[PDB]
Design a binder for this molecule. Structure first.
Ligand SMILES: [Mg+2]
Ligand SMILES: [Mg+2]
Ligand SMILES: [Mg+2]
Ligand SMILES: [Mg+2]
Ligand SMILES: [Mg+2]
Ligand SMILES: [Mg+2]
Ligand SMILES: [Mg+2]
Ligand SMILES: [Mg+2]
Ligand SMILES: [Mg+2]
Ligand SMILES: [Mg+2]
Ligand SMILES: [Mg+2]
Ligand SMILES: [Mg+2]
Ligand SMILES: [Mg+2]
Ligand SMILES: [Mg+2]
Ligand SMILES: [Mg+2]
Ligand SMILES: [Mg+2]
Ligand SMILES: [Mg+2]
Ligand SMILES: [Mg+2]
Ligand SMILES: [Mg+2]
Ligand SMILES: [Mg+2]
Ligand SMILES: [Mg+2]
Ligand SMILES: [Mg+2]
Ligand SMILES: [Mg+2]
Ligand SMILES: [Mg+2]
Ligand SMILES: [Mg+2]
Ligand SMILES: [Mg+2]
Ligand SMILES: [Mg+2]
Ligand SMILES: [Mg+2]
Ligand SMILES: [Mg+2]
Ligand SMILES: [Mg+2]
Ligand SMILES: [Mg+2]
Ligand SMILES: [Mg+2]
Lengths: 122, 156, 129, 80, 205
RNA sequence: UAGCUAGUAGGUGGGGUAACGGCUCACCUAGGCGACGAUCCCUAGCUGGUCUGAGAGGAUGACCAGCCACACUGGAACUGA
RNA sequence: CCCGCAGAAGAAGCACCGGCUAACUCCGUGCCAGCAGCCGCGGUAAUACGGAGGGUGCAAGCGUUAAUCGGAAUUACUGGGCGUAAAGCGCACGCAGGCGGUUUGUUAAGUCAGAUGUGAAAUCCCCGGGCUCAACCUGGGAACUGCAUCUGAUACUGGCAA
RNA sequence: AGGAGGUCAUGUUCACAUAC
C-alpha cells in the first residue's frame, strides 16, 4: 500500500513450485522400470492408458506414460523419462522418451517420427 | 469513401420457454482515415443482418479527432468500464503497435504511428469505447492555445 | 488534520471547475500566492486577489472557455508523504509540453519550461494539464 | 580543513570514551521516501568532558581500540 | 539454404506476380496466376490480420530470395539505423549486391543474378566479390569480369531488362557492361504495391 | 530464530608486530551490541558484466577480466622482500 | 589466396494443418487403438487418432524436454485494491515511528547549479577502419545513472530564534 | 379516509447442431 508500509514490509515475491519436481532441473532422467501396467482415465475419457512405475537415479519413484502404439517394456528395463503430464490420468507427470536406451521405436510410423524415434524409411 | 471493418462477431442466447434462441451480435468501426471515426454495435438473428445493421449504426454517430499527420498529439489515457487504454504518439514509420480492438480503431481513424497498451480487461466492446473516448479527449496546440488565451508559438 | 494546503488549494480549484463556480476562496499563504500567480501568468485562471489582514483570504476567478472548464486535469506530485526532486535534465513535460508543471527552484516558483531555460531544477509542486 | 561529522551523544558511561549518533537523510533506493537512518560510532573522548544529549563534532583518526577509531574535535550545545 | 522448389507456385500463393520468371512470356500464359496452389486452391478463405502480416512478410522474402534468419537480421539493422525503419529495411534489401546486379540488367531473374554473383563473374571496385548478400555502397562500380563478359545469357538478360523499366538510381553502361550505384533508392522510387508497415509491426510483436 | 556477549566493552602499564590495535598479559572500571533486527538456522564465492525487459525492474555470476578462498582431511612453523 | 581441368555433375530435411495459429480432403478405425500446451477429440461418414495426396512454417537444420525473463498492471515505486467478488483489526487510549496552520529572520542539513578527482580494461551505444560480405577484430567518443571534495543559490523540506 | 379481530422421502450416468 503506502510507501511507508512497503518500506517496513517489502513485496515478498511469489515463489513458484515446479510442475516437474523429480527431474531436479534436468532435461531427462534414467530410471529402471518396476512395473508396467494399464489404468483408466478420468471421467470424460475412457481407454486403457499404458503407464509404468519408474525408479529414477535419485531414489524418486514416479509414474510415467508410454506413448505410441505398443511397447517392449517390462521389469528391469532401463528407460529415459522426460517431463510433461498426461492430464486425464491423475498421477502421471512424465513421458518415456520413445526411441532411447530400451524403448524401441513404435513400429511403422510415417509422419512425426522424430517424436517417436523411428528411423527414416528407405 | 469511408473505410470500414468488422472487429468481432459473437453469438448470444435468450433461453425462451421453448428453448434457446440464438442470435448474433456484430461490432464494426468505420472512418474516413483523416480524423472522423465511429463505431456501431448492431445485433440481429443472422450474421449478414448483424453486420449490415452495425455498419448503418456506425456511419451515424461519428466523432472528430484532432490529429497530427497520422499521429496523436500527446499521450492519452482512456478509461471505460473494465478497460484502461494508454496511447502514445510514437515517431514516424513505426506502424500501429496496438492490441485487438485498438488496432482496428486506429487503422480506420487514420493514425499510423502510435504506441498502445490495453490494461484492465480486454473485452472488445469496452476497449473500443475507451479508445474512442480517449481519442475524443485529446487536445491540439491550436485549441489549447485558444483555450488558454495565448499564441501557439508561446505554447510551442 | 489539514496536512497539505497546496493539495487543498488544487482540490478546491478542481472541485470549483467541476461545480461551475465562478470563483473560489481559501486561507492564503505566500506559497499559494506564488502558485496562483504562476497560474494567472499561464492563463489557467482569470485573476487572483487577496483580502483581509489578520487571516488573509485568497480568491481566484476560474476561467471557462466554451462552457467546458479550462483546467482539464490538475494534481499534486510531491506529496508531504513523498517528496519529489528532479534535476535539470529530468524536468518532466506534461502532455508533451502542452500542459505545464509548477517547479519550485532556488530562484522562486516558475513553470517547467522557464526553469529548463534558466538551467536549474528543483522540487515539483503540481502537474497542470 | 578536515572531514568532520556532527552527531549527538547517546552514552558516556564508559571511561575516556563516548558513543555518538550520526543520523542522516538518505533517500530510499526503490521507493524514494527519505528515511532517516542512524549510525552508532565509538569516539575517543579525553578528560571525559562530554555528556549525553550534547552535539559533538568528531574526526576520524588511527584506531585506538578494538572498536574505537574516531576522536573528538570540539563539544557544542552542552544543554541538558 | 536457398529455396529450390517450383517458382510460380510462390507467385500463385501470393496472388500476384513476383518476377520469379524471366518475363519473356506472360505469367498467365505460363500458369494459372489466379488460383492458389494445391488441391483446395480454388476456394478462398478469409485470412486474419496475422494472416495478412505473415503474407506480406513472405511476399517480400520470396521477392528478394532472403531466408528468415537473415531477414530478421535485416529488420534489426533497419530498426537500429536512424530514421524510418521500413524505408531503411527496403533500402538494405535493394542494396543487396545480387539485387543490384539484377536491376542493372546482368541477369534475367534474381536467381540468375545470384548464380552470376556466386560463380565469380561480378566485380565491385575492381575486386571479385563472391557473396550474394554483399552490401553495395553509394558511388560504387559494379562490372562483370573480362573472362565471363563473353557469355550469351548476359546479352540476353541485358536485352530483357532494356524493355523493362529502368531504375534511376544506378547508371548502366551496357556497352562495356558496367554500372555505377548512385545512391540509396527512395520509397517513392521503389514499388508502391509492397505494403510496408506490416513487416515492422509484425516483427515488433 | 529475542535477547546475545567476561578478553567481552573501555582505561593504565608490560610484552608483541614492519605497523595501529585486547594482538597478548596483569590490574581497574561495568560496560558493549540489539526492533535501523543483535544472536541463531538455511543457503551462497563477490564485481565489471550476461539474459530478459519500452523502462523501472526480475533472473543470473559459464567463457573474458579484477578480488578473495582452497590445494587428500586437521594442525604448526621454518626459509624468505 | 590465385590460376587451370572435368562434369549438373558429390550435397534437403524436420515439424505442423479443430480454435488459439499460416496451412484440407480421402481411406483405415469405432469411447477401442490412441492424441493432447489450454479448450477438448474418438461410441460408424473424425478437417483433432493412424496412412495417403495436398499445403503451410523453418532450413543444415528441425522438433520435444529442462531453466530465466516477458505477456503477468498476477508483489502494482513507475503501476492495484479492500460495501457485496480475497481483503477495514470488535472498540478505544497511547510510547517509539510517520506527517505538520501562518509570519519574519538566520543556518544551509536535505535540495538545485558549477567545478575537480574517481567511476580499470573489456562488454552495451554512436561515428569510422580491416578481414571478398557477415559473424569477428579494432580506432575515437559517448555512457558507466555513483561516490567524495570545493564554491555558489534560499523557492520548498529540515534545524534554531522570535 | 385511520386501526384491528379470526400431509408429499427419492430419481443410473453421458450425450444437445447451425458462426456470411
Ligand atoms: Mg484481468
Ligand atoms: Mg582493530
Ligand atoms: Mg544458416
Ligand atoms: Mg598497550
Ligand atoms: Mg610498548
Ligand atoms: Mg558453496
Ligand atoms: Mg513489462
Ligand atoms: Mg547475487
Ligand atoms: Mg569452470
Ligand atoms: Mg581428489
Ligand atoms: Mg594443509
Ligand atoms: Mg623471515
Ligand atoms: Mg487459418
Ligand atoms: Mg500430433
Ligand atoms: Mg471415416
Ligand atoms: Mg492425422
Ligand atoms: Mg511485473
Ligand atoms: Mg486486482
Ligand atoms: Mg460471500
Ligand atoms: Mg468477501
Ligand atoms: Mg469497524
Ligand atoms: Mg486513536
Ligand atoms: Mg508548514
Ligand atoms: Mg518532527
Ligand atoms: Mg547543502
Ligand atoms: Mg569501462
Ligand atoms: Mg566494412
Ligand atoms: Mg572500443
Ligand atoms: Mg528554509
Ligand atoms: Mg524554515
Ligand atoms: Mg437416495
Ligand atoms: Mg434410498
Amino acid at each position: 500500500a503506502t510507501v511507508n508500509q512497503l518500506v517496513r514490509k517489502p513485496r515478498a515475491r511469489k515463489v513458484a513450485k515446479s510442475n516437474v519436481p523429480a527431474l531436479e532441473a534436468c532435461p531427462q532422467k534414467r530410471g529402471v522400470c518396476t512395473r508396467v501396467y494399464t489404468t483408466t482415465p478420468k471421467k470424460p475419457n475412457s481407454a486403457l492408458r499404458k503407464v509404468c512405475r519408474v525408479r529414477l537415479t535419485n531414489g524418486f519413484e514416479v509414474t510415467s506414460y508410454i506413448g505410441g502404439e505398443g511397447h517392449n517394456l517390462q521389469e528391469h528395463s532401463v528407460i529415459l523419462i522426460r517431463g510433461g503430464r498426461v492430464k486425464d490420468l491423475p498421477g502421471v507427470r512424465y513421458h518415456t522418451v520413445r526411441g532411447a536406451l530400451d524403448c524401441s521405436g513404435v513400429k511403422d510410423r510415417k509422419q512425426a517420427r522424430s517424436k517417436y524415434g523411428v528411423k527414416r524409411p528407405k | 469513401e469511408l473505410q470500414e471493418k468488422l472487429i468481432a462477431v459473437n453469438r448470444v442466447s435468450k433461453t425462451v420457454k421453448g428453448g434457446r434462441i440464438f442470435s448474433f451480435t456484430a461490432l464494426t468501426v468505420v472512418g474516413d482515415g483523416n480524423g472522423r471515426v465511429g463505431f456501431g454495435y448492431g445485433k440481429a438473428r443472422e450474421v449478414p443482418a448483424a453486420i449490415q445493421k452495425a455498419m448503418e449504426k456506425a456511419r451515424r454517430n461519428m466523432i472528430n479527432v484532432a490529429l497530427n499527420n497520422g499521429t496523436l498529439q500527446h499521450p492519452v489515457k482512456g478509461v471505460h468500464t473494465g478497460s484502461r487504454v494508454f496511447m502514445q504518439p510514437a515517431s514516424e514509420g513505426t506502424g500501429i503497435i496496438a492490441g485487438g480492438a485498438m488496432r482496428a480503431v486506429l487503422e480506420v481513424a487514420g493514425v499510423h504511428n502510435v504506441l498502445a497498451k490495453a490494461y484492465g480487461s480486454t473485452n472488445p466492446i469496452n476497449v473500443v469505447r475507451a479508445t474512442i473516448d480517449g481519442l475524443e479527449n485529446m487536445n491540439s496546440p491550436e485549441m489549447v492555445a485558444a483555450k488558454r488565451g495565448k499564441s501557439v508559438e508561446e505554447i510551442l | 488534520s489539514m496536512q497539505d494546503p497546496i493539495a487543498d488549494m488544487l482540490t478546491r480549484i478542481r472541485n470549483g471547475q467541476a461545480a461551475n463556480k465562478a470563483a473560489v476562496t481559501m486561507p492564503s499563504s505566500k506559497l499559494k500566492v506564488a502558485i496562483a500567480n504562476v497560474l494567472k501568468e499561464e492563463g489557467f485562471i482569470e485573476d487572483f486577489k487577496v483580502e483581509g489582514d489578520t487571516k488573509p483570504e485568497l480568491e481566484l476567478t476560474l476561467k471557462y472557455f466554451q462552457g467546458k472548464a479550462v483546467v482539464e486535469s490538475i494534481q499534486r506530485v510531491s506529496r508531504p508523504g513523498l517528496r519529489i526532486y528532479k534535476r535539470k535534465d529530468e524536468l518532466p513535460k506534461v502532455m508533451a509540453g502542452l500542459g505545464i508543471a509548477v517547479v519550485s527552484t532556488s530562484k522562486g516558483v516558475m513553470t517547467d519550461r522557464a526553469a529548463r531555460q534558466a538551467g536549474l531544477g528543483g522540487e515539483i509542486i503540481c502537474y497542470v494539464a | 580543513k578536515i572531514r568532520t561529522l556532527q552527531g549527538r551523544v547517546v552514552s558516556d558511561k564508559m571511561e575516556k570514551s563516548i558513543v555518538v549518533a550520526i543520523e542522516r537523510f538518505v533517500k530510499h533506493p526503490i521507493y524514494g521516501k527519505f528515511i532517516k537512518r542512524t549510525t552508532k560510532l565509538h569516539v575517543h573522548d579525553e578528560n571525559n568532558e562530554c555528556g549525553i544529549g550534547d552535539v559533538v563534532e568528531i574526526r576520524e583518526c588511527r584506531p585506538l581500540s578494538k572498536t574505537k577509531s574516531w576522536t573528538l574535535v570540539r563539544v557544542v550545545e552542552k544543554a541538558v | 539454404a536457398r529455396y529450390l522448389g517450383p517458382k510460380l507456385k510462390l507467385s500463385r500463393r501470393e496472388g500476384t506476380d513476383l518476377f520469379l520468371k524471366s518475363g519473356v512470356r506472360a505469367i498467365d500464359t505460363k500458369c494459372k496466376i489466379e488460383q492458389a496452389p494445391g488441391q483446395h486452391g480454388a476456394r478462398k478463405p478469409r485470412l486474419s490480420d496475422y494472416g495478412v502480416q505473415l503474407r506480406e512478410k513472405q511476399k517480400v522474402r520470396r521477392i528478394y530470395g532472403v531466408l528468415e534468419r537473415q531477414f530478421r537480421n535485416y529488420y534489426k539493422e533497419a530498426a537500429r539505423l536512424k530514421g524510418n525503419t521500413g524505408e531503411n529495411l527496403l533500402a538494405l534489401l535493394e542494396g543487396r549486391l545480387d539485387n543490384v546486379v539484377y536491376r542493372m540488367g546482368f541477369g534475367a531473374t534474381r536467381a540468375e543474378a545470384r548464380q552470376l554473383v556466386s560463380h565469380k563473374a561480378i566485380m565491385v571496385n575492381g575486386r571479385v566479390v563472391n557473396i550474394a548478400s554483399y552490401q553495395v555502397s553509394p558511388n560504387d562500380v559494379v562490372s562483370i569480369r573480362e573472362k565471363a563478359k563473353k557469355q550469351s545469357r548476359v546479352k540476353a538478360a541485358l536485352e530483357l531488362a532494356e524493355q523493362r523499366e529502368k531504375p534511376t538510381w544506378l547508371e548502366v553502361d551496357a556497352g562495356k557492361m558496367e554500372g555505377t550505384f548512385k545512391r540509396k533508392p527512395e520509397r517513392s522510387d521503389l514499388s508502391a504495391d509492397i505494403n510496408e508497415h506490416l513487416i515492422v509491426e509484425l516483427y515488433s510483436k
